[PDB]
Amino acid sequence: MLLKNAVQLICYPDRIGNNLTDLHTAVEKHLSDAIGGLHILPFFPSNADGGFSPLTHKEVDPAFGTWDDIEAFTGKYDLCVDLTVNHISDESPEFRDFIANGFDSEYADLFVHVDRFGDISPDDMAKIHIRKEKEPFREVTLADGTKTRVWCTFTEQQIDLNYDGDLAYRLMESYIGFLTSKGVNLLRLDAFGYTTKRIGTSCFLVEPEVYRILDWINEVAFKHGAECLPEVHDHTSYQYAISRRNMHPYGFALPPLLLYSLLDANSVYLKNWLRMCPRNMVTVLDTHDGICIPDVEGVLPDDKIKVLIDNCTFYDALMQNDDAYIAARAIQFFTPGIPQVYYVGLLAGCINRNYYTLNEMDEAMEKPVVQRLLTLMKFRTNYPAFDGHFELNYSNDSSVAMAWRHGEHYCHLFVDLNFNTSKIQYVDVKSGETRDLEF
Amino acid sequence: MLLKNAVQLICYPDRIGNNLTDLHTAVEKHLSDAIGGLHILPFFPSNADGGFSPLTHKEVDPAFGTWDDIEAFTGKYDLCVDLTVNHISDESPEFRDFIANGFDSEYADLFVHVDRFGDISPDDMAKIHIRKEKEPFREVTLADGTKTRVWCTFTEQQIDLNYDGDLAYRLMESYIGFLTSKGVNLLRLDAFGYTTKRIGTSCFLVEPEVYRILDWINEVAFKHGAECLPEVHDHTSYQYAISRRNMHPYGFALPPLLLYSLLDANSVYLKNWLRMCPRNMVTVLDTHDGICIPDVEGVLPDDKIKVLIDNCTFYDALMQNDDAYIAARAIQFFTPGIPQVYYVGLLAGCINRNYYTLNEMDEAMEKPVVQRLLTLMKFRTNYPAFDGHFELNYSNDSSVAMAWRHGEHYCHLFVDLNFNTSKIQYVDVKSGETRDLEF
Amino acid sequence: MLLKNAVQLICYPDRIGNNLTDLHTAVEKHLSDAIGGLHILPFFPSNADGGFSPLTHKEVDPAFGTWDDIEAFTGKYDLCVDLTVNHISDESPEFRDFIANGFDSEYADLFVHVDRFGDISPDDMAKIHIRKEKEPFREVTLADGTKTRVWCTFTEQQIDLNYDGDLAYRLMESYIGFLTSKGVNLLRLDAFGYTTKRIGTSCFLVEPEVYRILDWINEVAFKHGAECLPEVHDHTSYQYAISRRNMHPYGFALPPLLLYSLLDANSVYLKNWLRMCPRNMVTVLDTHDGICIPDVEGVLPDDKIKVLIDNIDALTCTFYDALMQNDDAYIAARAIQFFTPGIPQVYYVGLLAGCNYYTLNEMDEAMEKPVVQRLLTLMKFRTNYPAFDGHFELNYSNDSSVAMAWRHGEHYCHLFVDLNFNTSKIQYVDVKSGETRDLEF
C-alpha cells in the first residue's frame, strides 16, 4: 500500500557526516537503489533524552539542518519520523505558558495533574508499570510561586500529555498535519503505552483505552497521507493487537530470536515464529536502543532465552562473524514486513551509536561484508517477488528455507545455521532461468 | 459471514437417544434457541477408528438414520461434518477395485504406493512424524496373488490418499459437492497434515505443499457454499497459518490454558493469548478426542504446563466445580470465534464419550449447572454484541475482563479466578439500561 | 615396543634455552632421573597452527636444531613426537605438485575432492562433526586457472588426506619410518578422528572404519619399533575403544575430574573413574589445548560439571590457575595423576610452576621453588620406585579423601590425599631394610 516495500535506513541526522545535507550525500552516493526510505531519529529542538523531549515537532533543530534538507528525501524515499505522543519538553511553548499563567493558562489541560486523582494508595502505586525508581511526579514551581505536580514518566524535562482532556489530541493532530505536509509517510509512535493513565491500573497499555487512542491517531495520520509504527517493548501479544488495527508493529521478537537461532544452530523456534509472525511489521535487527528481552518471551522458551542470555551492535553478538551476520540480514529481509537496517549495522560497526565522517563511510562501504549487505539490500528493495506472498518451506531443524512469489518472480533463501551459509536463488524473468545471487 | 455466529453442539449421531431422529428431538426440545449449528461426528459407513475410515462420504450409515434425517437440521442450523481428506476405508468401492484389478485399476493412482519412493533410508524414516510404532506401510494381497504396499498412517483399514496424483482431488470434490448439496456448511478436515507425503521430510504439514492442498479444498468448498475447519494438533503457529488462508482454525490452545488459569488463579497467559488469539477460530473446551498438550506450547510456559500436568471430560479437570466450569464456558464464549460445546459438556458428565437416553438428557438438563450453561448458550447465540468487535479490558493478574460491542449492544464478562465468579453485564437496548445476566 | 613406565616431559624444542641442545642440557642437569621420556611438540617445517601444519615430518626447522639434536635424547629417553595423520600443509611438495599438475598429478588421490559426491544435502552437512563455522571445504585455484575444492577441516593451509585411496597410507608409513629411524618411540596421532570421511555420516570417529585405519597405523608403528598415542577429544567411550586395540588413549577425563574433586572436596567420582579407567593410557593434567568438557561427560554428573564450570569461568586456564595457584592442591593433583594407572606426562610449564619461554638460568630459578622441589621428589619417586611396575590397588576411603596404592612384590607405595586440606602423604616400603618410610614432599 502507501509505503514502498523496500529496505529502510535507520539513522541519526548528524552521525554520517555532520548534518542532513551530509546524510543526503551518503544515501545518494551509496544507497540510491538499495533503500526506499529512511527513519531519521529525532531531529526537532529537544532538551533531554537524546532528542525525545521535543519543544515542538514543527521545527528542525538548526544543528541538523532545515525542512528543505528534510524534503530533499521526501520526493524519492519514504520518510519515517518519531512522534513523541506521550510527552513534550518542559521548555515547549505550551508548558512554559502553563508555568507562567498557572491553571488559568489555556494549555493547562494539556498535562496530567497528579492532584485530580487525589491520594493514590500504595496498592495503586504498585500497579504502575515504570522503569525509573522515583515516583512519576514532578513538582514544579509556577510563576506565582505555587507548587503543583505533573505526571512525568521519564526525565524531568519530559512532561506527559493528558489524554483524558482535549488539547492533547489537538496538539498531536497539529504535529501530524505539519509533519505530513513535509513529506513524512510513517509516524513512529514513541512510548504510546504510557498515554493511558488510570489509577488502579498499570498506566501502561491500559486496554481498550490504548486502542481507542491508537485508532484515533491512525485516522488522523490516514487523512494526512501517513501510516503509523507504534513502538512498544512488551509481550508480542501487543504486536499482534497493533497489527490488527491497520498499523505497523515492530518485529522486536526477531533479533534475539536470530541470535539464539544462529548461536545454537536451531531453526525450530524461528520457523514457528515465521509461520505466525504478525504481518505488516517493520523488522529490525539492531535498533537505536539495543537489546530487549521481553519482546521474545513466548516466542523463545525460557530455557533457550537463558542460553541466549548466558552466551551491543548486532554484529558483535554474532562475534563479528560475517557469514552469520549476512545470513541474519538475509533471514530478516525475507521475513514478512518492511526491513529496516540501522546505519551502524550497514557499516559493520563495533555503544550502539557511532559517528562516521563521509570518508569513513566510503571506507566502511569497501568492507567485503558490507558489499555482501548492499547486494542483499538492493535485491530486497528491487526484486518484484517480495511484493507477492510469503511461502515458508520445509527445512530440517538446523536450517531455514524462505521464499517469495509474485507472478513469474520467485526467489528462495536457504540458510544452514551450522555453517552460516546464505544461498539465494531467484528467477530472472527476462531469460526465464534460475540464477544465484552473488553475496 | 457464511456461518451463524452462534454456539454449536458437538455430538455423535447415536449417543443422545439412538439416532439422528432422536438427536433432532433433543435439539428442538431444549436447544432450539441456544445453538445455531451442530458438528455431528462421523456418520458415514465406516469399518474402523470410530467412524474415521469411511467407505464413502455419500451415504449415511443406516444405523444412525438417512440423509433426510440430516437435512432436518439443514434448514435451521449450521451443519459441520468431518471430511476425512487423508484416507478412506479399504472397504471403499475405490480400494476394493484396486485390489481386484491391480495396477490396471483406474483408481490405482488414488493411493500412495511405497514402491515409487524406492528404498527409504533410515534417516528418511526417522524424519516421518507418526504416532504409531509400526512402519506406515500396509502390504496388501491383490486379487491375482501379488503383494504390494500402500501408505497407511493409521489403522490398517485406513488407506491414505495420493495428493501427488489427480484422482484424490476428484474424489474429494465429489464428496464436498454431495455433502454440500445435503446442507453442510462447514467441513472439518480430519488429519490434513498427513496429506503431504515427501521422502526426506516429516510427511506432516510439509510447507508450502500443505497450504496449496489446503487452498484448493477451500476453493472447492467455497464454490459449493461451505467453509473449512482444518483440524491439526501441533504448535499454534499452524493455527495462525490456517487462519490466514480464509479458513477456521481450532482454538486448541484454550482448554489447557483455562485449566491452568483456573487451577492457579492466573490470567496473565490467558490475557496474552486473547490479545493474540487467531481469529475466525472454532473454540472448544472438551472435544471428542480429549487432552492435547502440544497445542498450548508457547501459549503457556513449560513450567506452568508442568503445574497443569502435575495437578477426561472438561468438567472433571475442574474437579466438578460448577462455578469454575461455568466461568470457563463464559470465558470461552467471549473468546473471538464460533464456540462449540461438546454434548457431554452440555450435560455435565463424568471416557469422554457417554450415551444418554432422551429421558436422561431431560434429567441432566434440570441440573443447576446445566441451566446456568443454557443461559450462557442462549445469550451467546442471540445477543447482538458478539457480532461486533472484541475489546479486552484491563484486569489484575487473577481476573479476566472481556467485552463485545455492536452498535448499542454491549456486554462485559468479568471472571474472578480466585473465587470462580461469573458476572455478565449487557445493554438491554429496548430500555437502554444495563442489566445483569442471571447465571 | 614397550615404553618406560616413568614421567614424561611435554615441552617445546626452543622454549628452554634457545634450541634442542639447551633443552638437552637442561634435561640432564635437573631431570636426568625424574623423567624417562620426552614429548617434544612440533618442530617440523610448518606454516600455521603453531606447528601442526607440517610441510613434512622429515625435517627439523633449522631454528630449533637438527635431527641429530633429537637423537641425542634417544638412548636414555623415550621420545614422543606428533604425527599429523589427518592433513598436511598446502605448501607441502605433494600438494604444491597438485597445484601445478591438476588431476594429472600422481599425488591427486592423496587428497579429498569435495566434488566426488555431487550435491551434499543439508541433512548430510548437518551430520558433519566439525568445530569451525565454515564448510570444511577449501576451493583452490589450479595451475590451469580452474577452481576445484578439496576437503579442509581446519585452517585453509591444512589439507586433509584421502584415506579411501592408497597414497595416504604410503605417505603415513613413510613418515613413521623416518621418525622411528631418528628414535621416536611414541607417535601421537593428531586429529585421528577426521580421517574417516563419508557423506551421510559425522565424518569423525566413523565406526568401524576408524578402527581399521587406527589398527593399520598401529601395525606400521610396530614394524618400526613405535607405539601410538591416538588423541581424540570426545566421549570417554572412544578412549576405551582405543585402549582395547593395544594403543594408548589420553586420560582426558582426569584433569576436569580432579579439578572438581579438589575444588569440591569430593572423591566419589574420582574413585569410580579410577576403578574403571582404561588401561595403558597416557595421563596429563594441563595440555597444550586446555580443559575440554566432552572428555568428562558421564565420568562426572551434569550437576557437578556445572559446579566446576561455574567456578572456572569466574578452557584457557592453566591447571595451576584453576586450583587458584595453591601449591598443596597442585602437588596433590600431580601425586594422584602419578598413581593413576598409565604413563604420566608433565607439561614443562607445569614443571616450572608458571601461571612461556625460559632461559637456562631462569629454569635454575624455577627449579629452586619449593613447589617445584616437591614436584621433583614426586617425579623421581614415580619414575624410579618399582611398585608402579606391578599392579594398581585402589583403597577404601571416605568421600573427601583418596587412597591409591601400587604393589610389585616387596615394593609397595600408598598415596593418601585429604581433599579438605590438600595434604599429600606417600608411604613406601624400603625393600633392603624392610621398613615403611615416608616420602618427603
Residue numbers in the entry:
A (entry chain A), B (entry chain A): 1 to 311, 339 to 377, 392 to 480
C (entry chain B): 1 to 314, 337 to 377, 395 to 480
What does the literature reporting this entry say, word for word?
Heterotrophic bacteria utilize GG phosphorylase (GGP), a member of the GH13_18 family, via a two-step process consisting of phosphorolysis and hydrolysis for GG catabolism. Like MaGGP, MsGGP falls in the GH13_18 subfamily. The crystal structure of MsGGP, akin to other proteins in the GH13_18 family, consists of four domains: A (residues 1–85, 165–290, and 347–429), B (residues 86–164), B' (residues 291–346), and C (residues 430–480). The proposed reaction mechanism for the GH13_18 family involves a double displacement reaction, forming a covalent enzyme–glucosyl intermediate.
The MsGGP–Pi crystal (C2 2 21 space group) contains three protomers (chains A, B, and C) in the asymmetric unit. High-quality density maps enable the precise modeling of MsGGP spanning residues 1 to 480, except for regions 311 to 338 and 378 to 391 in chain A, 315 to 336 and 378 to 394 in chain B, and 313 to 338 and 377 to 394 in chain C. All the three protomers in the asymmetric unit of MsGGP–Pi structure contain a phosphate molecule in the active site with a clear electron density. In chain A of the MsGGP–Pi structure, a distinct electron density corresponding to Tris is observed in the active site, occupying a position similar to that of the glucose molecule in a prior structure. Conversely, no such electron density is detected in the other two chains. Notably, the positions of the Pi ions differ significantly among the three chains. In chains B and C, the Pi ions are situated in close proximity to the glucose molecule within the active site, whereas in chain A, there is a slight deviation from the active center because of the presence of Tris occupying the active site. In chain B, Pi is stabilized by residues Asp49, Phe52, Asp190, and Phe154, forming direct hydrogen bonds with Asp49 and Asp190. In chain A of the crystal structure of MsGGP–Pi, the inactive compound Tris occupies the glucose-binding site within the enzyme's active site, whereas Pi is positioned at a site corresponding to the glycerol-binding site in the crystal structure of MsGGP–Glc–Gol. Conversely, in chains B and C of the crystal structure of MsGGP–Pi, Pi occupies the active site of the enzyme. These observations indicate that Pi likely follows a path leading to the enzyme's active center, serving as a ligand-binding pathway for substrates such as GG or other molecules.
